[PDB]
From a paper:
Only crystals of HsCKα1 in complex with compound BR25 were obtained that enabled us to solve the structure and unambiguously interpret the electron density maps. As expected, the crystal structure shows that BR25 is located within the known Cho-binding site. Strikingly the compound favors the unusual conformation also found for BR33 in which a new adjacent binding site is formed that is located at the back of the Cho-binding site. The rest of BR25 is located in the Cho-binding site. While the 4-(dimethylamino)pyridinium fragment is characterized by a parallel π-cation interaction with Y333 and W420, respectively, the 4-pyrrolidinopyridinium fragment is tethered by Y354, W420, F435 and Y440.
In humans, CK is encoded by two genes, which express three isoforms CKα1, CKα2 and CKβ. An overexpression of the α-isoform of CK has been identified as an oncogene that mediates human cell transformation. As with many of the kinases that initiate the Kennedy pathway, the HsCKα1 is able to phosphorylate both Cho and Etn12.
Author numbering: 80 to 149, 173 to 457
The structure:
Amino acid sequence: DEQPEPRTRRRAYLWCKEFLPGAWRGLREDEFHISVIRGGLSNMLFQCSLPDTTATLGDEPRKVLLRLYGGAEAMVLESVMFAILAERSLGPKLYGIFPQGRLEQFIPSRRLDTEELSLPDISAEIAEKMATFHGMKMPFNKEPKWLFGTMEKYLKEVLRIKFTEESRIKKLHKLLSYNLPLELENLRSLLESTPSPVVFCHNDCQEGNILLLEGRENSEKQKLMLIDFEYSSYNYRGFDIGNHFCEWMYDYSYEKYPFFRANIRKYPTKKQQLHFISSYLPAFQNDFENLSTEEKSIIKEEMLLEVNRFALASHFLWGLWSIVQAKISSIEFGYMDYAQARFDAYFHQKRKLGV
Ligand SMILES: CN(C)c1cc[n+](Cc2ccc(CCCCc3ccc(C[n+]4ccc(N5CCCC5)cc4)cc3)cc2)cc1
C-alpha cells in the first residue's frame, strides 16, 4: 500500500469529501484511505476508500478511483466522451470531474495479458465489446480524417527529428531509408480502395486496456470491460479490428530492454480471425445470423481482407508514433526498437497480402 505525497493525500481527501455523497461528506481526514495504483508524471491513479468501520448512508461507493492528469478542446471531448460512456453502462461510472482529474467507479479487476487475447472465449467477447462500441453515436466529427491525419502529422515530426545520441541517429536513418512519404501514399491508395464503414473506434484495443472482471473469470460471457477511451474517434472499422489483431504480437511485460517482445507468429491465424469476426458481426448487426450461409461467408471473407489491409495502418501509425516518443518521451521504453518491429511487420504483412 504505497502512500501518496501529503499534498496529494490532502487534495484527494478534499475531492472525495466534496464530490461524493453520503458518508464521504462527513469523513475525517484521519480516516481517509488512499493508495497509489499507478504512479508516473501523468495520469497517476489512486484508490480512495472509506474506513471499514464507516457505514455507507445510501448508495454511495465505498471505494473510488482517482485519476490525476497532472488542449482545452481535448479535455472537453474526452470528458464528454467518458460521461456518455458511463451513462450508457459502457465504461466506469463518473463521480466527479475537476481541472486536475476525475473520480471514477472502482472496478475490481486485473488487465489481460497478451497470451489471453487468443483464448477463444476472450477473443469472442472482445469482438462483441468492440461491435458494441462501434454502434455508439457520439457528438464528435464523423469525417474519418483521424487515421491519415495522425499519420501525416507524425511523419512530418519524424522527418525533422535531430537526435544527438548515436544509436538513435543510426536507427532513425534506417527507418527513414524506406522513403516513408511514398510508402504512406501507397498505403493511402490501398486503403482508399478498401471499403470500411466509419464507426466510433476505440483505436487502442490492447490487453492493457481490457479488464478481466473479478469473480467473472470462470464465466463464459460478460467477463471483460474495455477501458481507456482517450484515443477514441470516428475511424475506419477495419483499423480498430486490425489494430487489435496486431496487438496479439506484442508483449509489453518484458522486464529487460527494450521492454517488449514481438512475435510475428502470434498474429491471429485466419481461423482465429474468423472466430473473432463471427462474434463481431452478429453483435454489430443482430439479424446477421438469419442471412444465408453463403451471404455470411462473403461478408466474412470481405471483412478478412478489410481488417488485414487496415492492420498495415496499425503498424505504420504505431511505428511513427514510437519514433516520435523516442524524441519526446520521458519514459524508459525501447521506442526505436519498437518502431523497427512495427515496420518489419508492416513489410512482412505487405508481402503476405501481395501488395
Ligand atoms: C492509439 N495510439 C497511437 C496510442 C494509444 C495510446 N497511447 C498511450 C500510451 C502512452 C504511453 C505509452 C508509453 C508508456 C510508458 C510507461 C510504460 C512502459 C512500459 C509499459 C508496458 N507497456 C509498454 C509499451 C506499451 N505500448 C503500447 C504500444 C506502444 C507500446 C504498452 C505497455 C507500460 C507503461 C504507451 C501508450 C499512445 C498512442
